Amino acid sequence: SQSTASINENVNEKCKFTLPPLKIHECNISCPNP
Amino acid sequence: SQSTASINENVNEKCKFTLPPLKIHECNISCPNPLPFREYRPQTEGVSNLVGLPNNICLQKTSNQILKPKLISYTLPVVGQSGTCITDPLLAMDEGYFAYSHLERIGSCSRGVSKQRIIGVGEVLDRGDEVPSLFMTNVWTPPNPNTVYHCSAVYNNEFYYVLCAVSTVGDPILNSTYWSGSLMMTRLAVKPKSNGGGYNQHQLALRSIEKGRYDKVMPYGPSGIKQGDTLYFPAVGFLVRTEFKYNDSNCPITKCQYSKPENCRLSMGIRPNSHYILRSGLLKYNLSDGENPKVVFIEISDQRLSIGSPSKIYDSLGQPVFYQASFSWDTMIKFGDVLTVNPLVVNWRNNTVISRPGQSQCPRFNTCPEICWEGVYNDAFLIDRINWISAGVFLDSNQTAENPVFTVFKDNEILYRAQLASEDTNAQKTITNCFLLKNKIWCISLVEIYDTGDNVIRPKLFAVKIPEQCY
Amino acid sequence: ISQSTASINENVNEKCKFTLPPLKIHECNISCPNPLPFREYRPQTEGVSNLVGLPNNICLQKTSNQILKPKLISYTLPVVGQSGTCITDPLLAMDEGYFAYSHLERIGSCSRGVSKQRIIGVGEVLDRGDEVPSLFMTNVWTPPNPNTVYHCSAVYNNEFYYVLCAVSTVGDPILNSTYWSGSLMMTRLAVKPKSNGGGYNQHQLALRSIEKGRYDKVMPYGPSGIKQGDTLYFPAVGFLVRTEFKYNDSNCPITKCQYSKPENCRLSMGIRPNSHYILRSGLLKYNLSDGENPKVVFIEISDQRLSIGSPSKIYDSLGQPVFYQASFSWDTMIKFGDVLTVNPLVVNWRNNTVISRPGQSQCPRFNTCPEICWEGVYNDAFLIDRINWISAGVFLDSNQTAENPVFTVFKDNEILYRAQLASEDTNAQKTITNCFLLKNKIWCISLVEIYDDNVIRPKLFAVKIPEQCY
Amino acid sequence: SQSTASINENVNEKCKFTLPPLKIHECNISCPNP
Amino acid sequence: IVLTQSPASLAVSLGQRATISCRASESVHDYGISFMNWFQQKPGQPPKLLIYSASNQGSGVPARFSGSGSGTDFSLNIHPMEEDDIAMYFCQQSKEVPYTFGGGTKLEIK
Amino acid sequence: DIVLTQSPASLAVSLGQRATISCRASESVHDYGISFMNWFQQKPGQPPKLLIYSASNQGSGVPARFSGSGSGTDFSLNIHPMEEDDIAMYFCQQSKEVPYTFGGGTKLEIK
Amino acid sequence: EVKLEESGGGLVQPGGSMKLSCVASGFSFSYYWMNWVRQSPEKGLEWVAEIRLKSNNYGTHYAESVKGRFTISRDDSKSSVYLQMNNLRPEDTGIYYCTRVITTVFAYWGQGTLVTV
Amino acid sequence: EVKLEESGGGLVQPGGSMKLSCVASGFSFSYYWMNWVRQSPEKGLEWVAEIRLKSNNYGTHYAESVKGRFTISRDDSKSSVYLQMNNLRPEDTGIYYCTRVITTVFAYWGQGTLVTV
Ligand SMILES: *[C@@H]1O[C@H](CO[C@@H]2O[C@@H](C)[C@@H](O)[C@@H](O)[C@@H]2O)[C@@H](O[C@@H]2O[C@H](CO)[C@@H](O)[C@H](O)[C@H]2NC(C)=O)[C@H](O)[C@H]1NC(C)=O
Ligand SMILES: *[C@@H]1O[C@H](CO[C@@H]2O[C@@H](C)[C@@H](O)[C@@H](O)[C@@H]2O)[C@@H](O[C@@H]2O[C@H](CO)[C@@H](O)[C@H](O)[C@H]2NC(C)=O)[C@H](O)[C@H]1NC(C)=O
Ligand SMILES: *[C@@H]1O[C@H](CO)[C@@H](O[C@@H]2O[C@H](CO)[C@@H](O)[C@H](O)[C@H]2NC(C)=O)[C@H](O)[C@H]1NC(C)=O
Ligand SMILES: *[C@@H]1O[C@H](CO)[C@@H](O[C@@H]2O[C@H](CO)[C@@H](O)[C@H](O)[C@H]2NC(C)=O)[C@H](O)[C@H]1NC(C)=O
Ligand SMILES: *[C@@H]1O[C@H](CO)[C@@H](O[C@@H]2O[C@H](CO)[C@@H](O)[C@H](O)[C@H]2NC(C)=O)[C@H](O)[C@H]1NC(C)=O
Ligand SMILES: *[C@@H]1O[C@H](CO)[C@@H](O[C@@H]2O[C@H](CO)[C@@H](O)[C@H](O)[C@H]2NC(C)=O)[C@H](O)[C@H]1NC(C)=O
Ligand SMILES: *[C@@H]1O[C@H](CO)[C@@H](O[C@@H]2O[C@H](CO)[C@@H](O)[C@H](O)[C@H]2NC(C)=O)[C@H](O)[C@H]1NC(C)=O
Ligand SMILES: *[C@@H]1O[C@H](CO)[C@@H](O[C@@H]2O[C@H](CO)[C@@H](O)[C@H](O)[C@H]2NC(C)=O)[C@H](O)[C@H]1NC(C)=O
Ligand SMILES: *[C@@H]1O[C@H](CO)[C@@H](O[C@@H]2O[C@H](CO)[C@@H](O)[C@H](O)[C@H]2NC(C)=O)[C@H](O)[C@H]1NC(C)=O
Ligand SMILES: *[C@@H]1O[C@H](CO)[C@@H](O[C@@H]2O[C@H](CO)[C@@H](O)[C@H](O)[C@H]2NC(C)=O)[C@H](O)[C@H]1NC(C)=O
Ligand SMILES: *[C@@H]1O[C@H](CO)[C@@H](O[C@@H]2O[C@H](CO)[C@@H](O)[C@H](O)[C@H]2NC(C)=O)[C@H](O)[C@H]1NC(C)=O
Ligand SMILES: *[C@@H]1O[C@H](CO)[C@@H](O[C@@H]2O[C@H](CO)[C@@H](O)[C@H](O)[C@H]2NC(C)=O)[C@H](O)[C@H]1NC(C)=O
Ligand SMILES: *[C@@H]1O[C@H](CO)[C@@H](O[C@@H]2O[C@H](CO)[C@@H](O)[C@H](O)[C@H]2NC(C)=O)[C@H](O)[C@H]1NC(C)=O
Ligand SMILES: *[C@@H]1O[C@H](CO)[C@@H](O)[C@H](O)[C@H]1NC(C)=O
């Protein structure tokens, strides 16, 4: 049963999106982590 | 089987994504040093304050094209990028030095995305042909351009102190009920050294603020004055409307058909039913208080009381002169000699010829109480203290903000003027600072011209020589 | 089951691996309240750029209308000095929105004065807010000894401005060429300096290997050069031993001149009839990718209208290098034209019969007959249109003396229009012209030595070239 | 096997990477997919 | 970009003015420049550049010829007409590739 | 000390005519590009009123009728046309140096 | 509205002393230089004494003819200027005016107080 | 004197091929863009192809009617431009001109070579 539970966990812990670093012309945007 | 359903649901809820709205009032922005080196110049002469001399000027009325405005280089002469806009400028001058700042935005001008804020100082020098120009020597930038608002500057003892409001809720004027009330001060050297973090660009925390009965106070105006070791910045206090003690019987609703006695009170807020009411005044910062000096708010007296607005206090021809922008129903230029600095009492000039443009609600030359919040900051610098002649750039239209004109005037007369742009050119804020170059009076006027047609929208810097002969 | 489990685990992390580079907001679509016109983002065209690729509109007709209206921007360079000084040997180079400028400041009357400072610096050419292209100098280098740096020439390449100078402890290396060591030095200045850049901002490059071919010594000699990829070409002059010079006097243009000899056009190649060294123009090629401490290679100019090596300029205009050579010889018609080949250097000199320059007693303006002289000034020209071969520049509209600088636009056989920069009786000498686009319009900046203080001081005139003669 | 297929199909269908529009305060920034 | 010229054929008395118009389906303007060229072709000869960039005179082209226009509205103006102006005149768009020519206007003398 | 001489000692000008009063300084009052020469109009029973300052600046509450000019050591007050209310002692003042000095005054009357 | 009002005049015998006082209103007294000028038909107008600002360390200047006998002082909190005249001489007879100086110019004058010795 | 001289013309039946060659002289060939333009009674002047510089990686552009059939190339050392025309159709009949482009303008034209299909 743990193998199945692992799949569920693997998706949410491994596959996730956060916004990228951003730039405006030659100038860097650096934000706090969520 | 149920465990399969669980996995599919978890994938659809967590794998699929969108992102939160970005909040840059918390996020830092770091741009390349805007001025890694000072512009090379061979030790030329500077300018002095317009104090102590009975300079010759044309003080007669004339229709001649007597004024011949020059357009000079931008304070920070770098190439703007297509798509950017420079807004909310500051320009201050004292003893040959200037302080300057601007906010650089992407997209729209008034409501775009800020990428950086420039705050810096420099020298006002003869550029080489007996025309003054602004040479930047020291530029500081905050790490977060979306938290610095409404800066004002005062020069003192080779440092130029810049007092700014700090806000994580946006413009403190509009979101005043959620503003933290925090202020910060930056001390920039006007003669930088090769090193020394505490000398060239020192930041001060303002831990103690004496607001009196005001809930919040903030800098609100391009520049201030010094008196010895004490700095006085233009400022506005936020008083709870219900704590405002005002007699409606003192509202000048005479010679009016459409007025109400309440208009003078309601018009002092941004909105007729706003929480806070805005009062003009000064923020006093005494450099000899100790290791951690306090900021003290000085309210302006109620003679011709109106809404707190961008203001300026400057030293001209021996005495401080206070200017308050006409952002309410009284559209006549409101400025005059400061009789007392603390409390602040101003002998407002009874000027009937200079007035700001507005909406149809409070149009140029309106002197009747009405409820509105609108106007532009178009100051006037005193150039003759005997005839009380002042000069500055005013917009010349009734219900629009356009046609910037450099005008030299008396309380009840306009002596002469020149256009700085075409008749239909849009313009907003103007800042006029006059000084002596080789003992002649020059005025540098920063004008926010919005010539949509092309390039990059920037303020333009005009250098206008005040003529001696009316010919 | 466990194999299927593993398959799913791999499937999801392999399929949704989505890391990505930072977003470029400046190369994106931003929509705000009260927006500005979007137009099109096309960087590096928004400021000052070279005259390349566009059929710009300029007036191509002759007129007496005052359509050229020069703006004085002399305040942009450190040429203010003081009443006690004189400025000599000016240099001004421009390329892709950047410039290099140099001058030597001497105390007292400069001809016999004492050097105080040799200044070499770089910066940007831009609209600084006055709607006139101005020079913004930020990076300045000064040598430990101002009396050794001579005849500098600048070439822009990859955000650096390379300045090749002669080093001499015997004074002007042309006048004392028999005692000159032949040593050159290379200075590399960043056009956009960094704080605490160190060698990034100012670097000295040793030149320990010079390929002179048959020449004894070679020297940089001209305001500016060109770049072709990784290789810089500086204007230069080679010093050949006179007795080695191969020239047939029978090819001397003595035809229709009864006051000359077949020998004059050969003798005039030196700075006097018996000069040990004979001077010939060419280029110094410096290849930035040819290993470390790369060699300098001298390329001599071909023998077409051959004249004494003189300050020359090679510049990129409208897609092709154009070579200009000052006339210090008897052939006083303006000598410039397309470069057919860079190495060897072959120039298709234009048959220009309207532009010339003042001389003195021997080789006066419009002289085309061989004589013995070494006289004249550098009066440049810059190409602004290839279809009609329209060039612009400042020439001295005089005969016997160097005076009356006039900015003019011309064709090989016609002068189309002009503007006087200084009065007729105002003395002037060296003039350098660099044209470029600003806001898609053609502007030319002319650096002109004009006499004031009783000294010569450079002045800069920013001239817009008009679309129509109105 | 039906369940295994179901999960892989759901992942292949829903776990796509596109770049959503970026909102800053009140400005809409729409960039092309990386 | 489609170019239409008119009149397709002109008959012009000597000493008189003639105008050849050119209609662009799309603006040929960019970089402050209208990319409109004109060519003159005589029997037995290749096309000769007559005008370029709408108004630039052209190499070796006499004042007898002039051009004007912007955007999508262009014209070639010949005055006074001479016998040596019997030629086919072409309108060319050079803003972008593919480059295009108009149908060609034939101008004769009456 | 800089001393001033005014002349003529007295004037008689018909109404509608020009009245001119001159000053000469023993030393230039020019400095900073400014000529520090002032004029005052004193009517009987009243304090002096600033009439002209810095050689040519008209002053406050002064009509177009009054103008002045000069530089260095040579200055003048030009009243034109003269009116019946211009009957006064006109004093010429030097303000470049300490002590400050005045001329003896020129009394202007009418005929 | 700038008002300068002198007081303390009158008749004082030679060898005696007098103190004049000018009360100023309608302006920022502390920022302006104040001067005394005296008038006598025999001499016309002549400058007597000047008192500078606190920021100038209250520097004073006197006409040579009164130097050492007169003292000029200020009391900014009362908006006033004082002239202390000791060892008075008949030569000091005249009308003493209080003036305000704006950019070196004696723009404002009081009505004046008569001093007779 | 600038000259462009076309050759390689002649009569080729439909489905065949021809190679045109432009010899360039009098100018610095390696710095200029070269183009081919064809002329016919039916179409007047029709642009065929463009070849950019080495610095542009010899980029090419073709009219859609010839794109995929024609190839344009250069040899800078030989100062020449070639046009390889494959799969010729009756539509291609006309005069092919070699031109030199100066800042986007077809300033110089050769005499042209006749291609009959
Ligand atoms: C711009 O407005 C002025 C002022 O108009 C008056 O004051 C306004 C606040 C509002 O109350 C108006 O209705 C008033 O008329 C105009 O100048 C006035 O013109 C009238 C004649 O129409 C004249 O009687 C007034 O005395 C003038 N007042 C002044 C100060 O000049 C002016 O004409 C308007 N200009 C434009 C373009 O609208
Ligand atoms: C400047 O010189 C030109 C040219 O003079 C001729 O060529 C010289 C090289 C030299 O050989 C002179 O002695 C020659 O006279 C003068 O222009 C000429 O003027 C004459 C009329 O006297 C005319 O016949 C020529 O065709 C003109 N040639 C040209 C090229 O214009 C010019 O007048 C002189 N200017 C001054 C101020 O002296
Ligand atoms: C934005 O810049 C400021 C200034 O550098 C950062 O403030 C520092 O934060 C660290 C956190 O570990 C503290 O130790 C420092 O003392 C802070 N500096 C000062 C002057 O107070 C801030 O964290 C940055 N914000 C982001 C998102 O990077
Ligand atoms: C924005 O971030 C980039 C890196 O992603 C910075 O560029 C680097 O700067 C260091 C020196 O501090 C160099 O050693 C690296 O080689 C640079 N990398 C690249 C790709 O250029 C850049 O300087 C930052 N911008 C600002 C304003 O700080
Ligand atoms: C003043 O600032 C506060 C704090 O940021 C704003 O309150 C937020 O408003 C947004 C809606 O625009 C909500 O989604 C947030 O949850 C609110 N945050 C908090 C802490 O209340 C407020 O709207 C701003 N007011 C004005 C007029 O700008
Ligand atoms: C508001 O001002 C009015 C006018 O000054 C005040 O009314 C006067 O009050 C005094 C007594 O103090 C009476 O003698 C006057 O006759 C009144 N005048 C009028 C026109 O009524 C009024 O009391 C003030 N109100 C407040 C709250 O201050
Ligand atoms: C600024 O602060 C200084 C220091 O506290 C003030 O100077 C003191 O003033 C008190 C009251 O008159 C004196 O008793 C002290 O002896 C003064 N100290 C010194 C060192 O002078 C100064 O007055 C304050 N200035 C302002 C405008 O508030
Ligand atoms: C403008 O006019 C007002 C009157 O409407 C003047 O007000 C005076 O101000 C002084 C203080 O400076 C008071 O002592 C007076 O009592 C006020 N007078 C009145 C009638 O209220 C004002 O001074 C004038 N402005 C100028 C520069 O003179
Ligand atoms: C930025 O995008 C938002 C949507 O995410 C726009 O807001 C919508 O505007 C339409 C206008 O027809 C309304 O019907 C929607 O109800 C609005 N949506 C929301 C959530 O309010 C917004 O106007 C865009 N702003 C800019 C400057 O482009
Ligand atoms: C050319 O260079 C030579 C060598 O330096 C110069 O000749 C020297 O002049 C100094 C005086 O300044 C003498 O003391 C040396 O003995 C001389 N050496 C030789 C070899 O002659 C010469 O003067 C220079 N000529 C010019 C025009 O500068
Ligand atoms: C500058 O020097 C480089 C390096 O030698 C030259 O490039 C090489 O040239 C040789 C021929 O001598 C070729 O065999 C190499 O394959 C070339 N290198 C590369 C990467 O292609 C370069 O041509 C020289 N520049 C100039 C203008 O001559
Ligand atoms: C100026 O005229 C001369 C003729 O006097 C032209 O000379 C030709 O130059 C080319 C290029 O070097 C040679 O290949 C020819 O052989 C030369 N012809 C003759 C007759 O000598 C020169 O080209 C003309 N200048 C220009 C720009 O066209
Ligand atoms: C930015 O705006 C431009 C329009 O100004 C967009 O251009 C469109 O591009 C698509 C292809 O993806 C074409 O089918 C449309 O016809 C184009 N629009 C117009 C008016 O021509 C561009 O795609 C936008 N870019 C982003 C990232 O949103
Ligand atoms: C010089 O040129 C002439 C004329 O062509 C020729 O006869 C003679 O042999 C040549 N001499 C030399 C050394 O080349």
Which helix (DSSP H) or strand (DSSP E) does residue B391 occupy?
Answer: strand B389-395
Task: Look up residue B7 and give its amino acid.
Answer: I
d(CA F58, CA F49): 12
The reply to whether residue F99 touches residue G104, judged by beta carbons under 8 angstroms, is no
Query: Can you tell me which residue has the tokens 């002393």?
Result: G17
- SS3 state at G30: helix
Which helix (DSSP H) or strand (DSSP E) does residue B334 occupy?
Answer: strand B334-340
Cβ burial, residue B14 (10 Å; 0-12/13-18/19+): middle
Measure CA of the first residue to CA of the last residue in chain H; give whole Å: 33
CA-nearest residue of chain D to C24?
A: D31
- Cα separations in angstroms, C10 against A10, A11, B17, B35, B333: 10, 10, 20, 51, 74
Q: Which of H46, H64, H104 sits opposite E94 (nearest CB)?
A: H104
Measure CA of the first residue to CA of the last residue in chain F; give whole Å: 37
CA of B176 from ligand 5 middle (Å) equals 12
Nearest CA to ligand 8 atom 19: B303
The reply to whether residue C36 touches residue B109, judged by beta carbons under 8 angstroms, is yes
Residue-wise DSSP of B174-191: TSTTS----EEEEEEESS
The reply to whether residue C57 touches residue E54, judged by beta carbons under 8 angstroms, is yes
Q: Which residues line ligand 1 (CB under 6 A)?
A: B 363-366, 398
Give yes or no for residue C290 CB within 6 A of ligand 11: yes
Among residues B35, B137, B378, the alpha carbon closest in space to that of C192 is found at B35
Q: Which ligand ends up closest to the CA of C248?
A: 14
Distance of CA C193 to the CA centre of its chain: 22
Residue-wise DSSP of chain A: -HHHHHHHHHHHHHS---PPPEESSS-EEE----
Q: Nearest C-alpha of chain E: how many angstroms from H49? A: 8
> Is residue B337 within 8 Å of residue B398, measured between CB atoms?
no
Give yes or no for residue C230 CB within 6 A of ligand 11: yes
Q: Which of C5, C13, C23 sits opposite A4 (nearest CB)?
A: C5
> Is residue B252 within 8 Å of residue B262, measured between CB atoms?
no
Task: Look up residue F52 and give its amino acid.
Answer: I
DSSP character for B32? P
> Is residue B330 within 8 Å of residue B252, measured between CB atoms?
no
CA of C145 from ligand 10 middle (Å) equals 19
d(CA B305, CA B250): 10
Give yes or no for residue D28 CB within 6 A of ligand 9: yes
Q: Which residues contact E34 (CB under 8 A, 6 or more apart)?
A: E28, E53, E54, E69, E70, E71, E74
In CATH, what number is assigned to the domain containing residue C277?
Answer: 2.120.10.10
Helices B2-14 and D2-14, axial angle in degrees (round to 10): 10
d(CA E36, CA E71): 9
Distance of CA C449 to the CA centre of its chain: 15
The reply to whether residue C387 touches residue E54, judged by beta carbons under 8 angstroms, is no
- Cα separations in angstroms, G74 against B124, B337, G5, G9, G112: 37, 22, 15, 18, 18
Q: Which of E37, E59, E90 sits opposite H44 (nearest CB)?
A: E90
Inside any domain, residue C470? no
d(CA C375, CA H70): 58
Q: Measured between beta carbons, which residues in chain E are less than 8 angstroms from residue H59?
A: none
Structure tokens given for F61: 């509450």
- Cα separations in angstroms, E16 against B66, B400, E39, E67, E110: 51, 52, 20, 16, 10
Q: Nearest C-alpha of chain H: how many angstroms from E57? A: 12
Total number of domains in chain C: 1
- SS3 state at G96: strand
Is the minimum CB–CB distance between F34 and chain B shorter than 8 Å? yes
d(CA C220, CA C286): 12
Best probe residue, ligand 7, of B225, B288, B294, B340 (max atoms within 8 Å of C-beta): B288
d(CA C234, CA C227): 9
The reply to whether residue B11 touches residue D15, judged by beta carbons under 8 angstroms, is yes
CA of C394 from ligand 6 middle (Å) equals 81
Q: Measured between beta carbons, which residues in chain F are less than 8 angstroms from residue G2?
A: none
Query: Can you tell me which residue has the tokens 């306009």?
Result: B414
Interface of B with C (CB under 8 A): 7, 11, 15, 33, 36-37, 39-42, 44, 71-74, 77-79, 81-83, 85, 106-113, 127-129, 131, 133, 452, 454-455, 457-458, 460-461
Q: Measured between beta carbons, which residues in chain F are less than 8 angstroms from residue B384?
A: 57
How do E105-109 and F4-7 pair as beta strands?
Answer: unpaired
Best probe residue, ligand 7, of B230, B233, B286, B342 (max atoms within 8 Å of C-beta): B286
Phi, psi of A6 (to 5 degrees): -60, -40
Cβ burial, residue B453 (10 Å; 0-12/13-18/19+): exposed
Q: Measured between beta carbons, which residues in chain A are less than 8 angstroms from residue D22?
A: 19
Q: Which of G27, G28, G103 sits opposite B52 (nearest CB)?
A: G103
CA-nearest residue of chain D to B3?
A: D3
Q: Which ligand ends up closest to the CA of C171?
A: 10
d(CA A33, CA B340): 52
How do H33-40 and E33-34 pair as beta strands?
Answer: unpaired
Do E and F count as touching (3 or more CB pairs closer than 8 A)? no
CA of B288 from ligand 7 middle (Å) equals 8
Domain ranges in chain F are: 4-110
In SS3 terms, chain C reads as CHHHHHHHHHHHHHHCCCCCCCEEHHHCEEECCCCCCCCCCCCCCCCEECCCCCCCCCCCCCCCCCCCCCEECHHHCCCCCCCCEEEEEEEEEEECCEEEEEEEEEECCHHHCEEEEEEEEEEEEEECCCCCEEEEEEEEECCCCCCCEEEEEEEEECCEEEEEEEECCCCCCCCCCCCCCCCEEEEEEECCCCCCCHHHCEEEEECCCEECCCCCEEEECCCECEEECCEEEEEEEEEEEHHHCCCCHHHCCCCCCCCCCCCHHHHCCCCCCCCCEEEEEEEEEEECCCCCCCCEEEEEECCCCCCCCCCEEEEEECCEEEEEECCCCCCCCCEEEEEEECCCEEEEECCCCCCCCCCCCCCCCCCCCCCCCCCCCCECCEEEECCCCEEEEEEECCCCCCECEEEEEEECCEEEEEEECCCCCCEEEEEEEEEEEECCEEEEEEEEEEECCCCEEEEEEEEECCCCCC
Region at C389 (left for phi over 0; alpha for psi -120 to 50; beta for the rest): left
Cis peptide, bond prior to residue F99, ω within 30 of zero: yes
Cis peptide, bond prior to residue C146, ω within 30 of zero: no
How do E105-109 and E9-12 pair as beta strands?
Answer: parallel
CATH code given to domain F4-110 = 2.60.40.10
Q: Nearest C-alpha of chain B: how many angstroms from A3? A: 11
d(CA B254, CA B79): 54
Q: Nearest C-alpha of chain C: how many angstroms from A13? A: 10
Inside any domain, residue B435? yes
How do E48-51 and E36-41 pair as beta strands?
Answer: antiparallel
What is the CATH topology of the domain spanning E3-109? Immunoglobulin-like (2.60.40)
Inside any domain, residue B290? yes
Inside any domain, residue B378? yes
Q: Measured between beta carbons, which residues in chain A are less than 8 angstroms from residue B32?
A: 26-27
Task: Look up residue B100 and give its amino acid.
Answer: Y
Structure tokens given for C290: 């040819």
CA of G55 from ligand 7 middle (Å) equals 15
The resolution, in angstroms to one decimal, equals 3.2
All structural domains of chain H, each given as residue ranges with its CATH number in brackets, are: 3-115 (2.60.40.10)
User: Which range of residues forms the domain containing residue D10?
Assistant: 1-34
- Cα separations in angstroms, H3 against C249, C412, G29, H99, H109: 33, 20, 89, 10, 8
DSSP character for E63? T
CA of C303 from ligand 14 middle (Å) equals 15
Q: What is the sign of the dihedral through the CA atoms of A7, A13, A16 and A20?
A: negative
- SS3 state at E64: coil
Structure tokens given for C194: 């960094």
d(CA F52, CA F30): 16
d(CA C296, CA C233): 10
Which helix (DSSP H) or strand (DSSP E) does residue B165 occupy?
Answer: strand B159-166
d(CA C254, CA C261): 7
- SS3 state at B250: helix
The reply to whether residue B338 touches residue G104, judged by beta carbons under 8 angstroms, is no
> Is residue B441 within 8 Å of residue B55, measured between CB atoms?
yes
The reply to whether residue B108 touches residue D11, judged by beta carbons under 8 angstroms, is no
Measure CA of the first residue to CA of the last residue in chain A; give whole Å: 32
Neighbours of B346 (CB within 10 A): 23
The reply to whether residue F32 touches residue B53, judged by beta carbons under 8 angstroms, is yes
Q: Which ligand ends up closest to the CA of B282?
A: 7
Do F and D count as touching (3 or more CB pairs closer than 8 A)? no
CA of E65 from ligand 2 middle (Å) equals 34
Q: Which of A3, A22, A23 sits opposite C5 (nearest CB)?
A: A3
Q: Which residues line ligand 5 (CB under 6 A)?
A: B 169-170, 175, 178
How do B276-286 and B295-299 pair as beta strands?
Answer: antiparallel
